[PDB]
Amino acid sequence: EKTAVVIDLGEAFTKCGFAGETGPRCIIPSVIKKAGMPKPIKVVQYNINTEELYSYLKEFIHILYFRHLLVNPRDRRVVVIESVLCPSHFRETLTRVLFKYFEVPSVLLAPSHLMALLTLGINSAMVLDCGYRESLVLPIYEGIPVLNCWGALPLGGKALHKELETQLLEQCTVDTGQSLPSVMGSIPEGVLEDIKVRTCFVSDLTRGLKIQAAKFNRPSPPPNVDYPLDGEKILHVLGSIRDSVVEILFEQDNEEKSVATLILDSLMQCPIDTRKQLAENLVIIGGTSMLPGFLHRLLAEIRYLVEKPKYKKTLGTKTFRIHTPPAKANCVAWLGGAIFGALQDILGSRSVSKEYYNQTGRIPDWCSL
């Protein structure tokens, strides 16, 4: 009858396509290309002028639906996959742009973790979404997301970018156009993403502990490979640096916090009957989880933290299984929204319509009244 639209906005990338198709049609990055502009500006931003955001969202949606969808969304429904705890200011702006400017029939602002759970096809699961800005945890038990049990450290893609920028600046080796360290003050983000995808090798638990021991009073430094760059300035990036950048994601000491500890804190907050099913079904999604050799380092670190005396008195013996999804780790949240929209013309009714928005005021966020 009518295949609905699926959107999954974010600061780094944006998964978008049709509901029903196994995986999206395209994934253009969040930034936009403007005429007479030095650098490309990011679309998804927080704490900034309302009318400017509205114009930025219109500009991104306009370049999206022609290239991605090849259709007017005026014919059929939309599924805007907002991550839970995405600012209400930003949701209101999205609601305005979809109804006032474009005039869609319906919209939906559903959470990312519940839809990622629909892909697995199980009702209870602990979920971790390691995106660009934050690494958010949220356990779901029998459909309902357990909200007060949660956690989100500023330790996703953006933290890894900042650490790469710091460590490369400290130890730099650029070719002539050899020596000459710290010539350029900063480096672009698109290049630094390509370095993370290709170079950064994720270490094991025993290797990670050896690196942590070396930092505070050297084993397994290799391997190292150079990275090519434009304008005839190749830089000889090292092997110990990229491993040290990955290590800060799992660094426990002096914060009592990490990607692994965040699941345990979420499990601690959850009730006793819910506890065991969440431990059995531990789902990992998001952008940072696509890194090579990540799921072992997490599961081994999780287990090491359970062996510690502080978590034995509550958790103890637990079968931590990581049931992986059908689609890739970044594109699990989108696939869930595509499942939610395509199949059920019935569950399209619960979402907010154009008729309801004009008279009322806004889509209902999880708040009072």
């Binding site: 200011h89 007060n148 989100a152 450290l153 002096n254 009592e256 009072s368 009244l369």
Partner: protein, 370 residues
């Protein structure tokens, strides 16, 4: 050995100390231990790394704070021993533990194991001659001067309501919740993620407590405030950057009356006050409604008492004279009562001596408290 006894008013958020027969506690500071983030190579004997009290308040950015107590129940005992040692040390009291008797405070219906381990610390590590543990509700009534009345209290750890009538504390009429100032601060942090201004670190968590203390107000009608659009008031950080708080300032303390927003089932402040009065005998209910006493820091929100009246009017029987009394010094009400209790001549009979503890043990401490 009858020296001027010390009154250590315990608490998860704040800890207070001084001497008997005083007007206000001279030594008040928050109950936590601070450790440097970027720690040294050794992970055993640290040096120059422990800050308790005003040093820790001064140097927030350096220290990763952690509270030893949670819901009026200590988790980390080594931290509480260091805090008690800091209280007795020359940086605060300038007196020995050997000289003076001790008056400790605890919330009602706590674990007995923690009470025994508390006594073990005071008797053996410190060399106390005599120790006495008491309730928060009984002390608040000593400070006001009354004998009758309910004591609703709301600290950082526990919220509980104990009805007392002419020096008769009713054990089966006690109500208790794990919903308090710390939890209110946790959900204000959760809501400021929805505003945009995310916080994560333990030093950074104290900014959320400062926002809660300063800019929060309880609406009379929560449905009416939701239908209306908020003004989005401002607040300056210690750094400098301005923060539009928005609807999170009024929705944060709503928690205490509506714990359904948590996702964990609790009675709430208003139900606990009614339930404590209802669970007591029929003839005592009207006197308990007339003498309602407030205490703790989470009763200091704007329009809190006005809301707490309206909830009592909704639940309680009609045509009954309600009266939620509250002193000027609500945070210090518990310490003042301890200082008054310590100054009385009966205090010598109530306490647990060192010799009596060595003979009997934990059983004598459980007998003397109740």
């Amino acid at each position: 050995i009858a020296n001027q006894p010390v009154v250590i008013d315990n608490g998860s958020g704040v800890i207070k100390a001084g001497f008997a027969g005083d007007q206000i506690p001279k030594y008040c500071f928050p109950n936590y231990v601070g450790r440097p983030k970027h720690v040294r190579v050794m992970a055993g004997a640290l040096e120059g790394d422990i800050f308790i009290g005003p040093k820790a308040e001064e140097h927030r950015g350096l220290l990763s704070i952690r509270y030893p107590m949670e819901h009026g129940i200590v988790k980390d005992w080594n931290d509480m021993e260091r805090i008690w040692q800091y209280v007795y040390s020359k940086e605060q009291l300038q007196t020995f533990s050997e000289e003076h008797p001790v008056l400790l405070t605890e919330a009602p219906l706590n674990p007995r194991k923690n009470r025994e381990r508390a006594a073990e610390v005071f008797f053996e590590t410190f060399n106390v001659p005599a120790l006495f543990i008491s309730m928060q509700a009984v002390l608040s009534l000593y400070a006001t001067g009354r004998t009758t009345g309910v004591v609703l209290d709301s600290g950082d750890g526990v919220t509980h309501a104990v009805p007392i009538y002419e020096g008769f504390a009713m054990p089966h009429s006690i109500m208790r919740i794990d919903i308090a100032g710390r939890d209110v601060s946790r959900f204000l942090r959760l809501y400021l993620r929805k505003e945009g201004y995310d916080f994560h670190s333990s030093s950074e968590f104290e900014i959320v407590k400062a926002i809660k203390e300063r800019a929060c107000y309880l609406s009379i009608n929560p449905q009416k405030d939701e239908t209306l659009e908020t003004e989005k008031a401002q607040y300056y950080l210690p750094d400098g950057s301005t923060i539009e708080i928005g609807p999170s300032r009024f929705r944060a303390p709503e928690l205490l009356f509506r714990p359904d927003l948590i996702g964990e089932e609790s009675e709430g402040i208003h139900e606990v006050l009614v339930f404590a009065i209802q669970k007591s005998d029929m003839d005592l209910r009207r006197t308990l409604f007339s003498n309602i006493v407030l205490s703790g820091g989470s009763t200091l929100f704007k329009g809190f008492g006005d809301r707490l009246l309206s909830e009592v009017k909704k639940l309680a029987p009609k045509d009954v004279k309600i009266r939620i009394s509250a002193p000027q010094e609500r945070l210090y009400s518990t310490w003042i009562g301890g200082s008054i209790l310590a100054s009385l001549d009966t205090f010598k009979k109530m306490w647990v001596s060192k010799k009596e503890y060595e003979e009997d043990g934990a059983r004598s401490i459980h007998r003397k408290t109740f």
